[PDB]
Write a protein that binds this ligand. Sequence first.
Ligand SMILES: O=C(O)CCON=C1c2ccccc2-c2ccccc21
Ligand SMILES: O=C(O)CCON=C1c2ccccc2-c2ccccc21
Lengths: 116, 116, 116, 116
Amino acid sequence: KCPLMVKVLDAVRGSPAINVAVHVFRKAADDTWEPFASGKTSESGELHGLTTEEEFVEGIYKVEIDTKSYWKALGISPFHEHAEVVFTANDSGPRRYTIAALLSPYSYSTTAVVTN
Amino acid sequence: CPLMVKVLDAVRGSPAINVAVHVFRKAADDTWEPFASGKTSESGELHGLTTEEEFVEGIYKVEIDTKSYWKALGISPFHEHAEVVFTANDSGPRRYTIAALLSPYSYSTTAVVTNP
Amino acid sequence: KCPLMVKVLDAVRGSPAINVAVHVFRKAADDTWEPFASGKTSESGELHGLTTEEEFVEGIYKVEIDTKSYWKALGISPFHEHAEVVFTANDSGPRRYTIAALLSPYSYSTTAVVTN
Amino acid sequence: CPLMVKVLDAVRGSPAINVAVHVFRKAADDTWEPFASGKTSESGELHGLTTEEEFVEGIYKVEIDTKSYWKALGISPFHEHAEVVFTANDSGPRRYTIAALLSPYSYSTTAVVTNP
Ligand SMILES: O=C(O)CCON=C1c2ccccc2-c2ccccc21
Ligand SMILES: O=C(O)CCON=C1c2ccccc2-c2ccccc21
């Protein structure tokens, strides 16, 4: 909710993308990705409550949005296995990161909106 | 070829073929005058709309008839058309590619401008 | 607020696009665009209160987002005069239209999120 | 040329030149193996990464090193890189164009897939 929030929209139906699985990982010292947090988007296509200010320290993070299962459930053949968003969290910046993703079967866009 | 239009379909991951495109130029009386038109090819591209001589400085609108496109595929889309409005050649002649990426409830448009 | 809301984001700064002028028009019987509603986006990049359920009847509407002035204020040279979103409002659909726009100097995307 | 990568800069309205691109293929042990790499040309395109013979069915990741790109232009961007993960050739060989459109806090990626 507070420091990291994910929002997913469906460009085909013009709707929130509901029940999309989302996994967050943090990069470890041996360069592997450690599970950090996960959830499914709500009816408003949002996922809040992933982490806390205390836990969300500087580091490299990856957000993986399971887009292929979403399109499969709709009966629409998709290109990507999942959308991945990789970034370094930085304390000098604003306190709240919203990772937004706009999905189509053969294309996606992602935007970070970083606010105080 | 100072003006080229390229249209892609984000649902099918393909060129958007046979899409109507109308170009207008703003007249002295602030009205939109017809300038040129055509339909995208099998590669989703429309070349030959104008010439360097004809393509003078001015404000231009490129209307891409996306609703007709989606309707012919059985889809009822949100937008009537994608409109792209810009001032051209104000620093001297340039080569413009107007790209549009289409989904039923979303589109994006990008200009790629090169100095000949 | 209720039936029509506009949201604008800045892809360069990863922020809401604040103080962007937005004009809405409705198409008249003589095929001209009549001013309908307008405003400036807030600090959260949103514009609410444009119209009411009573006033927002079926018809063709155009939302014009004054992107060029926004980029000029930032000292960044932009391509488009403005982003235009043209659509037919339809009572058979959901009750609430959010027109979202993601802005970069040479590209923009727009998405309609239509909800109940 | 079964795999081509095209990268555009949405701030400058130009090809994104000299951008590093790394392709990986998922191995039998579920790890990512290096497959091919290169840098975009003056046209923002990268051709010649692979051959029809080499490009067998599998899961592929295309990593586009967008952070290095923006840094060299004086911009500190949000993402580390744009990642594009997909299953290839599962219905037989195809020709794939992976396009990426870049802004400092946003990117979009689109696949255009043609049957030879
Ligand atoms: O943090 C903030 O101020 C808001 C975070 O973003 N909200 C977004 C939002 C809300 C409603 C409908 C569409 C969108 C959207 C589309 C593309 C990109 C971002 C956003
Ligand atoms: O937004 C996105 O994901 C991509 C938007 O552009 N795609 C483009 C694209 C895709 C395949 C082949 C050629 C082109 C191209 C040429 C000139 C200008 C733009 C684009």
